[PDB]
Coordinates of C-alpha atoms in Angstrom, one line a residue:
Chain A
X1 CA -11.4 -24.9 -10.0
X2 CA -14.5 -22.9 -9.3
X3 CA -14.4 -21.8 -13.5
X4 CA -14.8 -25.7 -14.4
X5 CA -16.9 -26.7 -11.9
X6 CA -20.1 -24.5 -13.0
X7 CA -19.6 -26.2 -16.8
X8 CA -19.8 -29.7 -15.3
X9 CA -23.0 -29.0 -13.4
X10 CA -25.3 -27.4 -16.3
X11 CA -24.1 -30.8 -18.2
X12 CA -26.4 -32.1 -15.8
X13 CA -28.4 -30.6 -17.7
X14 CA -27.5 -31.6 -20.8
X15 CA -28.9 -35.2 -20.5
X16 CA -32.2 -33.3 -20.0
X17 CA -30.7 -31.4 -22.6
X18 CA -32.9 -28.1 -23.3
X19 CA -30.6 -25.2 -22.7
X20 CA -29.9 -22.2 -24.6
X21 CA -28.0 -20.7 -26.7
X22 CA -28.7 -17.8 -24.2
X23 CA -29.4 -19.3 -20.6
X24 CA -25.5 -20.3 -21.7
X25 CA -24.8 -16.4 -23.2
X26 CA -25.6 -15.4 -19.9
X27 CA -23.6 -17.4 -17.7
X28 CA -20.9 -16.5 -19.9
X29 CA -20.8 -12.5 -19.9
X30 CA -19.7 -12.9 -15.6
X31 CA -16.9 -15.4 -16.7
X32 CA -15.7 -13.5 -19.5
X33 CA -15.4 -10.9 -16.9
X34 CA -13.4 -13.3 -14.5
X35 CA -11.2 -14.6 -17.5
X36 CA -10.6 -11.2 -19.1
X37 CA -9.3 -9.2 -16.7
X38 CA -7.2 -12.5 -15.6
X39 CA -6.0 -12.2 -19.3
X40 CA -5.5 -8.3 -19.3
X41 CA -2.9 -9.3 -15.8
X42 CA -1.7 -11.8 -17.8
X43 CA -0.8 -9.9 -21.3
X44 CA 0.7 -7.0 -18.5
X45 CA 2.8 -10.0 -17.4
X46 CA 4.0 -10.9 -20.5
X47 CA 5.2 -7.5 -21.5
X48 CA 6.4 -6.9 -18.4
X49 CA 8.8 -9.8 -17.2
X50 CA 9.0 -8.8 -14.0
X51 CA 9.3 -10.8 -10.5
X52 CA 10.1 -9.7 -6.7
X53 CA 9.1 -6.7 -5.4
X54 CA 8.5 -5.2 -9.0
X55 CA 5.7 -7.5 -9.3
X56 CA 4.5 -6.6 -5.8
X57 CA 4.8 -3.0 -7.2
X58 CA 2.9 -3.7 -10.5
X59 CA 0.5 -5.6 -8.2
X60 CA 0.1 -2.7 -6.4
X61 CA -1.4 -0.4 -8.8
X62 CA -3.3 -3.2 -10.0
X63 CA -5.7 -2.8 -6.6
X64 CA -6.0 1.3 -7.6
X65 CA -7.1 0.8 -11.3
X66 CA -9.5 -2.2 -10.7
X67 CA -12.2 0.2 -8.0
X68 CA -15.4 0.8 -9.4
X69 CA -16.2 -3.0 -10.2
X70 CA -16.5 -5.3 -6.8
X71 CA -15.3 -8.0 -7.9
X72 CA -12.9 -7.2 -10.3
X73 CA -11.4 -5.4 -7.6
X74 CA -11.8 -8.1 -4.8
X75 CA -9.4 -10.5 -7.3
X76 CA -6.9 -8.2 -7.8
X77 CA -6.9 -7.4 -4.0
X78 CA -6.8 -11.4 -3.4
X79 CA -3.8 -11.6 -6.2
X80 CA -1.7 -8.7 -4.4
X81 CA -2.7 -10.7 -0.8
X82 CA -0.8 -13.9 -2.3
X83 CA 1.7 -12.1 -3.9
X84 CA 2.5 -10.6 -0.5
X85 CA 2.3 -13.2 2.2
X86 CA 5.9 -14.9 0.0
X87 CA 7.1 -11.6 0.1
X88 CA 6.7 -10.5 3.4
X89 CA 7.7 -13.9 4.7
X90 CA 11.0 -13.4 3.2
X91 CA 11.0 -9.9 5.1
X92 CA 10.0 -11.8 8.3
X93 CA 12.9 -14.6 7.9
X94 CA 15.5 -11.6 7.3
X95 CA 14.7 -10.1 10.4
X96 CA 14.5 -12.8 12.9
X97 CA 17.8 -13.8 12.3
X98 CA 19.4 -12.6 8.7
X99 CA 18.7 -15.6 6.4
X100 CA 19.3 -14.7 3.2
X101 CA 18.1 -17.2 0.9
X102 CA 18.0 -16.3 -2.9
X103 CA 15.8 -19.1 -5.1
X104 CA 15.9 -16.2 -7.8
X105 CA 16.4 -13.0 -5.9
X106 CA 12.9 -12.8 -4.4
X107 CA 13.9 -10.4 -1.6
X108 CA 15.7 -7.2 -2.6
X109 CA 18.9 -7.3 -0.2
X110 CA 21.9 -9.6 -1.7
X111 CA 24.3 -10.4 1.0
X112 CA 27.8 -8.2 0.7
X113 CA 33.2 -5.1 7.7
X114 CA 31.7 -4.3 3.9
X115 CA 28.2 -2.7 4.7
X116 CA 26.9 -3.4 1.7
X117 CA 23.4 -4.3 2.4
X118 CA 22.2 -1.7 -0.5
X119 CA 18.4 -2.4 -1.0
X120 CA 18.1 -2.9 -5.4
X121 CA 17.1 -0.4 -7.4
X122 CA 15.7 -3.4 -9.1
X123 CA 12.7 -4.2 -6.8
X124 CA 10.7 -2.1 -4.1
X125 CA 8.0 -3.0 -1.9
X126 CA 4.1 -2.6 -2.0
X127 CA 5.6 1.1 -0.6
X128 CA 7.7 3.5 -1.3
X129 CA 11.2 3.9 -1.1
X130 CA 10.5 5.3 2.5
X131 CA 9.7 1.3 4.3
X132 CA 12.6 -0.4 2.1
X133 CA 15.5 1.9 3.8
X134 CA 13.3 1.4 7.2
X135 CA 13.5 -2.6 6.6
X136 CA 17.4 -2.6 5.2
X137 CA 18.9 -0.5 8.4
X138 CA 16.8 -3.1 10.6
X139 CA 18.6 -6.0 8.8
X140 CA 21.9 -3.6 9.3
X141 CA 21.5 -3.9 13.2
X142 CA 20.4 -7.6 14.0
X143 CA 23.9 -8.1 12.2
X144 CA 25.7 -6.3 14.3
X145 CA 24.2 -7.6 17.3
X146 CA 24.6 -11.3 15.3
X147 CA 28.4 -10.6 15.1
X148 CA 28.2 -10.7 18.8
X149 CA 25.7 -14.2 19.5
X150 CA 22.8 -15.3 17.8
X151 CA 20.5 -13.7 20.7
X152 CA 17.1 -11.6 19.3
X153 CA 13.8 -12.7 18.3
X154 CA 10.7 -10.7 16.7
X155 CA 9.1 -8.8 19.7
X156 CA 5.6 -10.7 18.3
X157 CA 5.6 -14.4 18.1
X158 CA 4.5 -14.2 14.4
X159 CA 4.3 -11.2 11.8
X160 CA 1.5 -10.8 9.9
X161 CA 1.5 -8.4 6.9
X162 CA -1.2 -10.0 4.7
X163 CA -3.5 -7.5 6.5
X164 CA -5.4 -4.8 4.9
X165 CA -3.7 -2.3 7.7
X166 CA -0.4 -2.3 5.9
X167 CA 0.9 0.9 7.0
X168 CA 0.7 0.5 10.6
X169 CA 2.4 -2.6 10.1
X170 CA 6.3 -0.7 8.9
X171 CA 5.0 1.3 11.9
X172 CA 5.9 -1.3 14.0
X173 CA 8.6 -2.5 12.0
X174 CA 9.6 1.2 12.8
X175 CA 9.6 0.3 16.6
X176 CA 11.0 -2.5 15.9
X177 CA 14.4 -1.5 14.5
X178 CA 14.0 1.2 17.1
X179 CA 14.5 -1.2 19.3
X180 CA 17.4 -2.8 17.6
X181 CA 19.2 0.2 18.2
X182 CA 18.6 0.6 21.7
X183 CA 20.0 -3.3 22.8
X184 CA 22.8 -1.9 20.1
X185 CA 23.0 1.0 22.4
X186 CA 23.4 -1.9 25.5
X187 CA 25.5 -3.1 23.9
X188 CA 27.7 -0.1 23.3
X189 CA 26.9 1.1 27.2
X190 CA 28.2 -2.7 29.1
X191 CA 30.9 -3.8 27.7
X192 CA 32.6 -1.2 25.1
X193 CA 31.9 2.0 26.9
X194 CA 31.4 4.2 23.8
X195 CA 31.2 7.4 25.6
X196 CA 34.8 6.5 27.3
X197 CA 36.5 5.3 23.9
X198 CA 35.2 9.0 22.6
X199 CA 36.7 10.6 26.1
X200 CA 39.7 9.2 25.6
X201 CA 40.5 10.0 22.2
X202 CA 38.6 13.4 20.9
X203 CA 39.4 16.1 23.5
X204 CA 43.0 14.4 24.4
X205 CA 43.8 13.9 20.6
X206 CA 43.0 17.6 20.3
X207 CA 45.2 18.0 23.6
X208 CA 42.9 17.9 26.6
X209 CA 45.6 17.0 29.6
X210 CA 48.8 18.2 28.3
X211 CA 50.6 16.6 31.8
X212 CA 50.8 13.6 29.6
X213 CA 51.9 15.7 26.6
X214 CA 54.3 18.3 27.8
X215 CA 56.2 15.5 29.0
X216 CA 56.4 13.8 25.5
X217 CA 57.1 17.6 24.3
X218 CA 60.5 17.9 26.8
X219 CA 61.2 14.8 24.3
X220 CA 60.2 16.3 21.1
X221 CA 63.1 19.1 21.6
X222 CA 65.6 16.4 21.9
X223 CA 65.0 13.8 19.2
X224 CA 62.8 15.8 16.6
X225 CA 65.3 17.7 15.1
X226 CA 66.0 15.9 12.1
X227 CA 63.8 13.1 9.8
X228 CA 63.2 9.9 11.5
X229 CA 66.2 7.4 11.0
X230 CA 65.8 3.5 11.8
X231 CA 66.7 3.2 15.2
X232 CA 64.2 6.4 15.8
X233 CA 60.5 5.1 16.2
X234 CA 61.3 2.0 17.9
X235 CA 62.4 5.2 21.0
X236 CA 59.3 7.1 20.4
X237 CA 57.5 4.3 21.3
X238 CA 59.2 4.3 24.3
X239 CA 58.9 7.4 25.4
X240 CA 54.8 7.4 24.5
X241 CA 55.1 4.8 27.4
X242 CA 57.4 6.6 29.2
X243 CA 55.2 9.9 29.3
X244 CA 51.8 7.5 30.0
X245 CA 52.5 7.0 34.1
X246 CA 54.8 9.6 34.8
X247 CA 51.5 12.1 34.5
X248 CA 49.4 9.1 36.1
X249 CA 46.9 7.8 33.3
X250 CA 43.9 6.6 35.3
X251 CA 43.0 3.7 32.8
X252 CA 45.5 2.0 30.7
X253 CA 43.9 -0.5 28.2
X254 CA 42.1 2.8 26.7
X255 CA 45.7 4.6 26.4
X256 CA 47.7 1.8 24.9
X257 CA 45.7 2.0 21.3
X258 CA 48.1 4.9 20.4
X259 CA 50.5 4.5 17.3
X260 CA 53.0 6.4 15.9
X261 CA 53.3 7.5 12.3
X262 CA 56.9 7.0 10.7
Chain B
X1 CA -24.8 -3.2 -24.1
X2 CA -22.4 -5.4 -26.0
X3 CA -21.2 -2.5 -27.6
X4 CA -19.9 -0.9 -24.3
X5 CA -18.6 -3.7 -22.6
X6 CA -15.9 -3.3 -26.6
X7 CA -15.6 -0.1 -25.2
X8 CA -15.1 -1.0 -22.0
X9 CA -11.6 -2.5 -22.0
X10 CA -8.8 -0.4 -20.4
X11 CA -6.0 -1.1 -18.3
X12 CA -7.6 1.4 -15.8
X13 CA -7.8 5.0 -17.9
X14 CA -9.6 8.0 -17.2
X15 CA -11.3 7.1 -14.6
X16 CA -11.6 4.2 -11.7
X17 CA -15.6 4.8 -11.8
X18 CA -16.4 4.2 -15.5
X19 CA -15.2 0.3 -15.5
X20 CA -17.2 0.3 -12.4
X21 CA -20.0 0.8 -13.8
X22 CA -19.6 -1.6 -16.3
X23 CA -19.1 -4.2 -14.2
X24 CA -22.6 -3.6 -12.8
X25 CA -23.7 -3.3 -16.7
X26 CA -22.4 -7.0 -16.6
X27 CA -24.2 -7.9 -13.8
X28 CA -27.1 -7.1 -15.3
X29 CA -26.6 -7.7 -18.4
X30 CA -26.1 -11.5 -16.3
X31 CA -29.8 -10.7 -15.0
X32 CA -31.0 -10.8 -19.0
X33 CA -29.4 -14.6 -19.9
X34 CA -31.0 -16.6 -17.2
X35 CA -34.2 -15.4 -18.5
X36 CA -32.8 -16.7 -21.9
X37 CA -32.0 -19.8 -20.4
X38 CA -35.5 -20.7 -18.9
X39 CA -36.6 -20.1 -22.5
X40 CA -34.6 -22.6 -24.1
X41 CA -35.9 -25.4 -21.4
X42 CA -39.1 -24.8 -22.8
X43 CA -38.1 -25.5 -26.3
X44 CA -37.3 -29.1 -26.7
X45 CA -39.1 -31.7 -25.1
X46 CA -38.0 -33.5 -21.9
X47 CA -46.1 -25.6 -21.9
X48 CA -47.4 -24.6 -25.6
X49 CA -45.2 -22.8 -27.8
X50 CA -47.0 -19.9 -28.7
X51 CA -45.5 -16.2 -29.3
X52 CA -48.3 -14.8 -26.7
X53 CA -46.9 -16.2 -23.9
X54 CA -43.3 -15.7 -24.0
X55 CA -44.5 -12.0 -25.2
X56 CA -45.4 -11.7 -21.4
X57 CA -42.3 -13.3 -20.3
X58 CA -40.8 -10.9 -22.3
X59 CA -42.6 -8.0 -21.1
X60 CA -41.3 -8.0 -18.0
X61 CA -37.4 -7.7 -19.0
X62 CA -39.4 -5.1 -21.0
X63 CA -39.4 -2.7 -18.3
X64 CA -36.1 -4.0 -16.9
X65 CA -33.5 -3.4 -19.7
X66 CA -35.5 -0.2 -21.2
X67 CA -34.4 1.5 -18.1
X68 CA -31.1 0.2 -18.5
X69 CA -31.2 1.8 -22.0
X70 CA -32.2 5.3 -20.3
X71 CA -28.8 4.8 -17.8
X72 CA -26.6 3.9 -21.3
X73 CA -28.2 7.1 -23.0
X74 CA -27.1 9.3 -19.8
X75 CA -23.0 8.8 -20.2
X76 CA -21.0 8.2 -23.5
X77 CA -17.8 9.1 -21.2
X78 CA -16.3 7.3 -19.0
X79 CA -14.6 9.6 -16.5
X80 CA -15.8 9.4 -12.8
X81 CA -17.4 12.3 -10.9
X82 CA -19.9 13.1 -13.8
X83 CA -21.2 9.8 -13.1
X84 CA -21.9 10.2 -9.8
X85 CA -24.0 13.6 -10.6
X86 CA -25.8 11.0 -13.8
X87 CA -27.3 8.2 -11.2
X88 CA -28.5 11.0 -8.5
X89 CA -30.0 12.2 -10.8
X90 CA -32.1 8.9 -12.0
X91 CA -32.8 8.7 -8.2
X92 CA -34.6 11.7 -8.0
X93 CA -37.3 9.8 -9.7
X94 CA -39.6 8.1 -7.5
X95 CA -41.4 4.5 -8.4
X96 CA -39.0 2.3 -6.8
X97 CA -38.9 -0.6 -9.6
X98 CA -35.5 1.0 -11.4
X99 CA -34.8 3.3 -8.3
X100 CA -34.1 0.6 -6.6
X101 CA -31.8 -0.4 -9.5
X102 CA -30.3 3.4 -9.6
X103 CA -29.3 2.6 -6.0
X104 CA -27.7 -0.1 -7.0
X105 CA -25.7 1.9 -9.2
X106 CA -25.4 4.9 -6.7
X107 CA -24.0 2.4 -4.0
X108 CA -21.4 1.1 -6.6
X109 CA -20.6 4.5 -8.4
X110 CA -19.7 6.3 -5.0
X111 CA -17.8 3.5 -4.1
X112 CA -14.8 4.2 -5.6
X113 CA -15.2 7.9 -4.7
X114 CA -15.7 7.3 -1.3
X115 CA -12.9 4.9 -1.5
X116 CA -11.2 8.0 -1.9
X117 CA -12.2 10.0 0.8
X118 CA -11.7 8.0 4.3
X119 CA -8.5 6.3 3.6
X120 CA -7.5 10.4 3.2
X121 CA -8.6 10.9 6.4
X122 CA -7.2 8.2 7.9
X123 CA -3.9 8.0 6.1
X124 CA -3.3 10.0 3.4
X125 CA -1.3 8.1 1.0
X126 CA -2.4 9.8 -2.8
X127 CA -3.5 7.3 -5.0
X128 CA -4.7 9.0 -7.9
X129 CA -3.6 8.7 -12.1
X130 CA -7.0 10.3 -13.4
X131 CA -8.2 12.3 -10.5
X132 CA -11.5 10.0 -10.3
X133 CA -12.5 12.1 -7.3
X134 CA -13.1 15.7 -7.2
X135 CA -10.2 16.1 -5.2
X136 CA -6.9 16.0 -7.8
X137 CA -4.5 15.3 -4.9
X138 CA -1.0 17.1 -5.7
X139 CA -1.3 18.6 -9.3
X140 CA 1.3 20.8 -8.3
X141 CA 4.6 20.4 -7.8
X142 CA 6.1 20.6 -4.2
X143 CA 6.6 23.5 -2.0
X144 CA 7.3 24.6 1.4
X145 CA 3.4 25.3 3.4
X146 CA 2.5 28.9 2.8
X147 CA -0.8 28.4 2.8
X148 CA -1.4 27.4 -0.2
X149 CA -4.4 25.6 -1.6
X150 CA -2.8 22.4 -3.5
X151 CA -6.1 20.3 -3.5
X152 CA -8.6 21.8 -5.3
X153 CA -12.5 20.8 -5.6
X154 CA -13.3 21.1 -9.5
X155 CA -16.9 21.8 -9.7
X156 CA -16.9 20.0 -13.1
X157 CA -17.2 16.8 -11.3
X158 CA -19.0 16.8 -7.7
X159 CA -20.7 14.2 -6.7
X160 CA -25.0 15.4 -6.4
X161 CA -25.0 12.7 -3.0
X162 CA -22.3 15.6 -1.8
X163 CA -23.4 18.8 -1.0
X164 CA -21.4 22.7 -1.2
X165 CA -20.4 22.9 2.0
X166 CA -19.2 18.7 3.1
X167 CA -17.5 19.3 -0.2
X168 CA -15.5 21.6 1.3
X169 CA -15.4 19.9 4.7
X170 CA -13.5 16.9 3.4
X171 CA -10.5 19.4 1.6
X172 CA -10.4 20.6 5.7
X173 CA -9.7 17.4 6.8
X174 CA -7.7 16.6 4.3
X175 CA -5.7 19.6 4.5
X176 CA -5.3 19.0 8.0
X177 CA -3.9 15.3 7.2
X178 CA -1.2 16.2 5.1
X179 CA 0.4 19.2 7.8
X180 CA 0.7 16.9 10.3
X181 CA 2.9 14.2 8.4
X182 CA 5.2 16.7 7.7
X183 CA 5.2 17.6 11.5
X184 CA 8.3 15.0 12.7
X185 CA 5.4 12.7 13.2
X186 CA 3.8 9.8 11.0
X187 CA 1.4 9.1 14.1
X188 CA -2.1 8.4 12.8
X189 CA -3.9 11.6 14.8
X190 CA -3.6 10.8 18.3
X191 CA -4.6 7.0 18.6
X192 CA -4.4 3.9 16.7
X193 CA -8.3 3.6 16.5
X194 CA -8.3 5.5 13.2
X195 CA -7.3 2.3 11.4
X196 CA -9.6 0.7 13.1
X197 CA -13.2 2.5 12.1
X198 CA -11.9 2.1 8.7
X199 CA -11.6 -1.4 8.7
X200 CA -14.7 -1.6 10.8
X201 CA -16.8 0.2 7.8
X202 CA -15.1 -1.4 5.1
X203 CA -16.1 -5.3 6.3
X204 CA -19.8 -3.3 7.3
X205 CA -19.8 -2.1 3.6
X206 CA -18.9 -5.7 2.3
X207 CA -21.6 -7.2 3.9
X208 CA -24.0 -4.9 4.4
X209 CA -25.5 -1.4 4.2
X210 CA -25.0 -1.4 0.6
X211 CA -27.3 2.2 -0.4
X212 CA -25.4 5.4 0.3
X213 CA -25.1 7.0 4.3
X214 CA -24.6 10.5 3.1
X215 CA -27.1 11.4 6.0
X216 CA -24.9 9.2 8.2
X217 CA -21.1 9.4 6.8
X218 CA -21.3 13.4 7.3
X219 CA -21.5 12.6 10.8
X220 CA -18.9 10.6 11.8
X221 CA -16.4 12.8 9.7
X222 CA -17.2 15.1 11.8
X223 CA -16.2 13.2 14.2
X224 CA -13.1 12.9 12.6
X225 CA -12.5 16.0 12.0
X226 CA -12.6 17.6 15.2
X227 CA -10.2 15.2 16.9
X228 CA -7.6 15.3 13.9
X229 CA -7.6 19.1 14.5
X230 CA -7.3 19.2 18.3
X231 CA -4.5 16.5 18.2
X232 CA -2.6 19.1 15.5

């Protein structure tokens, strides 16, 4: 818009019609400037053929070669800041709740008890490596905490990364899966009692109270003589059961998770 | 001028400066064709056309683009860093009618380098492919810190608005930038408000102060540098 509208206004002139050959050569020399290097990006594209985060990566290197020339470089600054503000967007809308939304793959996680988050190799941010396994663990928790009730928000009420401070902005994305982990860490601390579940198993699997266990082994010198037969584990279930509250087991929905291999 | 702006045409190689400078060679080359243009309004009829008189409209781009002839003569390279040493040295001149236009030049060729140095400071993220400043950040492959001196200055391209010993002030600070990322921290040194001054100085620079503060950006550097180095 701003390239046609300069031809328009010197036709103004051209009812009065006395310009040059070179009044003309000169206004062309700064817009063979904006039109080449918007040629040179787009000859890069063609070659290319690249889209997501592997154009916000070519993009990228686009606002180190261009320095030296203002306004070359203040294009290709404004080219990266658009190519960003989709991008990061579609960071933002991952995070608030886990939306997913692929038009053509713009974002680099694909939807998978799988896990499976696994960034691409295909696409990486306007950073390294280092911000897209800071931004995939962050969409690895608000899962977790989704599988429970759609309850977090963003700690601000809008992210902005179409900033020129870019790398204080994963710094609070940092702090922000930080965070994550800590209501995952609530979460672990009200209502499953981590620390119990790993009590209860670790020390006793090795053998922790053997009360409970030297009373299952006056009934492993009885029965565990020969292979197990078919009438066999359906009594070693009983006397796991049996051996629980003779030795006085001082919670019982955390002692009632043990099976017994055939 | 025509010439170079054929040669000018790179994807962005050996060196971030040497486009730079051509995009101020098309700036004023720019500065040349609206003087053509006010010609051509004389021509047709809508003055007397006589060779006299546009000989003294002519005279006065005389002294313009002859100077401009005396800043193509300097550099047939392109590579940054020798540039910089090629326009302090056409500042050195006095008459300010094209030392005011070397300024020009000075303000845009250090502005890449500089572009270098305080986002070093204040982040340290290496961004070079040429090594357009002085300082080739990591040439060598990585190693555990013993010491050793990875950044070196390369005398073969200091900038002349840089003196001996700030050129070995800002490998200090930069030094110091790098040992304390790999120090479980990637805390910008011991407040947030080292983004800020840098965004403060870029808008500043965008708008205003356009000639070099090499009297000026030495000091607040400093002022980096000792509170970088007490927070380590």
């Amino acid at each position: 818009k701003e390239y046609m509208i300069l031809i328009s206004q010197l036709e103004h002139l051209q009812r009065q019609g006395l310009l040059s050959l070179q009044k003309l050569w000169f206004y062309i020399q700064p817009t063979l400037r904006t039109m080449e290097v918007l040629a040179s990006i787009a000859t890069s594209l063609n070659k290319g053929e690249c889209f997501g985060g592997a154009t916000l990566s070519l993009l990228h290197d686009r606002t180190f070669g261009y320095t030296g020339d203002s306004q070359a470089q203040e294009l290709c600054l404004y080219l990266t800041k658009a190519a960003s503000a989709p991008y990061f967007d579609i960071l933002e809308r991952w995070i608030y709740r886990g939306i997913i939304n692929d038009p053509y793959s713009e974002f680099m996680v694909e939807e998978h008890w799988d896990q499976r988050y696994t960034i691409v190799q295909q696409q990486i941010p306007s950073f390294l490596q280092k911000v897209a396994d800071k931004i995939l663990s962050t969409g690895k928790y608000l899962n977790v905490v989704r599988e429970c009730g759609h309850d977090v928000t963003c700690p601000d009420a809008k992210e902005i990364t179409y900033t020129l401070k870019e790398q204080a902005y994963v710094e609070r994305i940092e702090k922000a899966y930080n965070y994550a982990s800590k209501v995952l860490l609530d979460f672990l601390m009200e209502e499953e009692e981590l620390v119990a579940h790993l009590r209860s198993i670790k020390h006793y699997f090795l053998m922790d109270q053997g009360d409970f266990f030297v009373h299952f082994m006056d009934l492993t010198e009885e029965e565990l003589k020969k292979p197990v037969d078919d009438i066999i584990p359906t009594r070693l279930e009983a006397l796991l059961e049996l051996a629980l509250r003779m030795s006085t087991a001082n919670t019982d929905p955390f002692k009632d998770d043990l099976k017994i291999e055939l | 001028i025509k010439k170079y702006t054929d040669q000018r045409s790179l994807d962005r190689a050996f060196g971030l400066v040497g486009q730079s400078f051509c995009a101020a060679l098309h700036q004023e080359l720019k500065e040349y064709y609206r003087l053509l243009s006010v010609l051509h309004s004389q021509l047709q009829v809508e003055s007397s056309l006589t060779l006299r008189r546009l000989l003294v409209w002519t005279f006065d781009p005389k002294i313009r683009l002859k100077t401009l002839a005396a800043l193509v003569d300097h550099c047939q390279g392109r590579k940054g860093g020798e540039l910089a040493s090629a326009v302090h040295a056409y500042t050195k001149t006095g008459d300010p009618y094209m030392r005011s236009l070397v300024q020009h030049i000075l303000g845009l060729v250090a502005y890449p380098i500089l572009n270098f140095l305080y986002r070093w400071i204040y982040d340290g993220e290496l961004e070079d492919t040429y090594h357009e400043f002085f300082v080739a950040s990591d040439p060598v492959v990585k190693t555990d810190r013993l010491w050793h001196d990875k950044y070196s200055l390369r005398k073969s391209m200091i900038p002349s608005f840089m003196t001996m010993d700030q050129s070995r002030k800002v490998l200090l600070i930069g030094k110091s930038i790098n040992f304390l990322h790999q120090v479980c921290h990637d805390q910008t040194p011991a407040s947030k408000a080292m983004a800020v001054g840098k965004s403060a100085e870029s808008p500043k620079d965008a708008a205003e102060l356009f000639t070099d503060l090499e009297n000026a950006f030495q000091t607040k550097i400093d002022a980096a540098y000792f509170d970088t180095s007490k927070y380590l």
